Design a protein around this motif. Sequence first.
Motif, mmCIF file in Angstrom:
data_model
loop_
_atom_site.group_PDB
_atom_site.id
_atom_site.type_symbol
_atom_site.label_atom_id
_atom_site.label_comp_id
_atom_site.label_asym_id
_atom_site.label_seq_id
_atom_site.Cartn_x
_atom_site.Cartn_y
_atom_site.Cartn_z
ATOM 1 N N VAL A 170 72.800 61.080 54.670
ATOM 2 C CA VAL A 170 72.325 62.118 55.604
ATOM 3 C C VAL A 170 72.485 63.508 54.990
ATOM 4 O O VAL A 170 73.309 63.742 54.101
ATOM 5 N N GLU A 171 71.645 64.439 55.453
ATOM 6 C CA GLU A 171 71.631 65.829 55.016
ATOM 7 C C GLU A 171 72.512 66.659 55.955
ATOM 8 O O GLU A 171 72.155 66.858 57.123
ATOM 9 N N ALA A 172 73.666 67.127 55.459
ATOM 10 C CA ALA A 172 74.589 67.907 56.256
ATOM 11 C C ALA A 172 73.981 69.218 56.744
ATOM 12 O O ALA A 172 74.381 69.684 57.820
ATOM 13 N N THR A 173 73.028 69.786 55.992
ATOM 14 C CA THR A 173 72.436 71.051 56.335
ATOM 15 C C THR A 173 71.603 70.922 57.616
ATOM 16 O O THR A 173 71.525 71.862 58.385
ATOM 17 N N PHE A 174 70.981 69.750 57.843
ATOM 18 C CA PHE A 174 69.985 69.621 58.922
ATOM 19 C C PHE A 174 70.452 68.664 60.023
ATOM 20 O O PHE A 174 69.875 68.673 61.115
ATOM 21 N N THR A 175 71.447 67.830 59.725
ATOM 22 C CA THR A 175 72.053 66.981 60.740
ATOM 23 C C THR A 175 72.767 67.874 61.761
ATOM 24 O O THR A 175 73.317 68.955 61.407
ATOM 25 N N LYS A 176 72.794 67.444 63.030
ATOM 26 C CA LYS A 176 73.491 68.197 64.049
ATOM 27 C C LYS A 176 74.339 67.242 64.879
ATOM 28 O O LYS A 176 73.917 66.106 65.136
ATOM 29 N N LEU A 229 79.896 70.833 59.166
ATOM 30 C CA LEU A 229 79.605 69.489 58.718
ATOM 31 C C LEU A 229 79.671 69.414 57.196
ATOM 32 O O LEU A 229 79.221 70.313 56.485
ATOM 33 N N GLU A 230 80.145 68.281 56.688
ATOM 34 C CA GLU A 230 80.263 68.045 55.229
ATOM 35 C C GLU A 230 79.887 66.600 54.934
ATOM 36 O O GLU A 230 80.299 65.698 55.692
ATOM 37 N N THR A 231 79.186 66.374 53.814
ATOM 38 C CA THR A 231 79.068 65.023 53.238
ATOM 39 C C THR A 231 79.833 65.015 51.914
ATOM 40 O O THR A 231 79.336 65.531 50.925
ATOM 41 N N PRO A 232 81.089 64.553 51.872
ATOM 42 C CA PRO A 232 81.908 64.681 50.656
ATOM 43 C C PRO A 232 81.547 63.781 49.468
ATOM 44 O O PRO A 232 82.068 63.997 48.365
ATOM 45 N N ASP A 233 80.672 62.811 49.658
ATOM 46 C CA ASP A 233 80.384 61.816 48.637
ATOM 47 C C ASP A 233 78.972 62.030 48.117
ATOM 48 O O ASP A 233 78.075 62.498 48.856
ATOM 49 N N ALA A 234 78.729 61.555 46.887
ATOM 50 C CA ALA A 234 77.425 61.679 46.274
ATOM 51 C C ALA A 234 76.364 60.930 47.072
ATOM 52 O O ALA A 234 75.236 61.402 47.138
ATOM 53 N N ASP A 235 76.733 59.799 47.680
ATOM 54 C CA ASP A 235 75.806 58.968 48.403
ATOM 55 C C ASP A 235 75.501 59.535 49.796
ATOM 56 O O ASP A 235 74.579 59.045 50.425
ATOM 57 N N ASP A 257 89.555 65.767 61.999
ATOM 58 C CA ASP A 257 88.119 65.753 61.869
ATOM 59 C C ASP A 257 87.619 64.373 62.296
ATOM 60 O O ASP A 257 88.396 63.482 62.516
ATOM 61 N N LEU A 258 86.307 64.285 62.561
ATOM 62 C CA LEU A 258 85.646 63.024 62.848
ATOM 63 C C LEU A 258 84.848 62.645 61.606
ATOM 64 O O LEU A 258 84.248 63.503 60.986
#
Length: 97
Positions: free
Chosen positions: A29-35, A50-56, A20-21
């Motif tokens: 950033v918002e994973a739902t709307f980031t592209k 896409l995933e943001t694994p951290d709370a921040d 993965d990158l």
Amino acid sequence: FAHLKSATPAADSTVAAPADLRLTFSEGVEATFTKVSLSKDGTEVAIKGLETPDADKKTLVVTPAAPLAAGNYKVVWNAVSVDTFKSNGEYSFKVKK
């Protein structure tokens, strides 16, 4: 708004294929709307998600739909921050055999 601060693989690096990158931004950033668009040697390669694994939400994980083969990659990103500010950029890296 979100600026890219670092990535793994790093910008302009030459690496063995990653699973993965991971892009680290200056703001959440918002994973739902980031592209993110990924291309190898000038042709788009499919992204699974896409995933943001951290709370921040500062690190974004980009998983390709198929394993990354050796070649020249370009990452084009379009971030939507957690304060709904849109930014965009790009960087490149190489996967070696």
